[PDB]
Amino acid sequence: XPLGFAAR
Amino acid sequence: GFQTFEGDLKWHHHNITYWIQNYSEDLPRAVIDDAFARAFALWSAVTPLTFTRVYSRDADIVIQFGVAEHGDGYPFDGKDGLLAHAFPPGPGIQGDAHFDDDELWSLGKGVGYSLFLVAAHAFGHALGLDHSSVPEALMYPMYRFTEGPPLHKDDVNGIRHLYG
Ligand SMILES: [Ca+2]
Ligand SMILES: [Sr+2]
Ligand SMILES: [Sr+2]
Ligand SMILES: [Zn+2]
Ligand SMILES: [Zn+2]
Secondary structure (H helix, E strand, O other), rough: XXXEOOOO | OOOOOOOOOOOOOOEEEOOOOOOOOOHHHHHHHHHHHHHHHHHOOOOOOEEEEEEOOOOOEEEEEOOOOOOOOOOOOOOEEEEEEEEOOOOOOOOEEEOOOOOOOOOOOOOOOEEHHHHHHHHHOOOOOOOOOOOOOOOOOOOOOOOOOOHHHHHHHHHHHHOO
């Protein structure tokens, strides 16, 4: 695999 | 890796169904439902797609809140870091969107991460979009909080290349 969303 | 997806990574019917498998306790259930509905409404306005909530795992997009290893071999990482992940359109696990419940989920102005913004981004992947390199785009890979309209030209360009 999935695409992930990341916090800074 | 060796894992591969099936198909062309776009949906081939117009009424996309979604199932909310479970809930974070961080917000009222109706508030979570609405945040997801608003995220889908962002995409329905610019595509020929409609999004219909269903109530069994017989759904295109299954939505799940999970912590650490939550069933798909791609574990979440606790507080901060990875916030959510999503799979591109297709059968089975494809289409699905998972949110890390080790996060504090809020809405705009809340002390935690915006569930609306994260869902809008994750749903972009669940419709077939890749990450963008345009820093202001919704599909840029890093979370940023905005009160402004989430969609940018690059996001709309990408979605129309898939659906017209
Ligand atoms: Ca995390
Ligand atoms: Sr699915
Ligand atoms: Sr939480
Ligand atoms: Zn992403
Ligand atoms: Zn997952």
